[PDB]
């Protein structure tokens, strides 16, 4: 759903910003449960808001998202705190 969505959203709501605020629990419970596939997607979601830029508040609010994430290894941490 968040991947479709976002692609959706894209291709020009603030609903992008709470579909985030669902996989933020999961973050904050452990955040390495499943990993294993979801990276890629959530790499590649996380950027999409730093291509394309109309996104400001939602731009705003995944910063928050990170400041509470740095306390996921360094690389993974890194890679999205490097482009954006």
Do not use: Y
């Not at 959530?42 to 999409?48: C, K, V």
């Amino acid at each position: 759903s968040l991947q479709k969505m976002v692609r959706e959203h894209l291709n020009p709501s603030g609903t992008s910003e709470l579909v985030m605020l669902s996989l933020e629990l999961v973050k904050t419970r452990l955040a390495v449960m499943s990993m294993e596939m979801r990276k890629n997607f959530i790499q590649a979601i996380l950027t999409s808001l730093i291509e394309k830029s109309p996104d400001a508040k939602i731009l705003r609010a995944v910063v928050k998202i990170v400041e509470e994430w740095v306390k996921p290894t360094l690389r993974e941490k890194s890679i999205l705190l490097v482009k954006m």
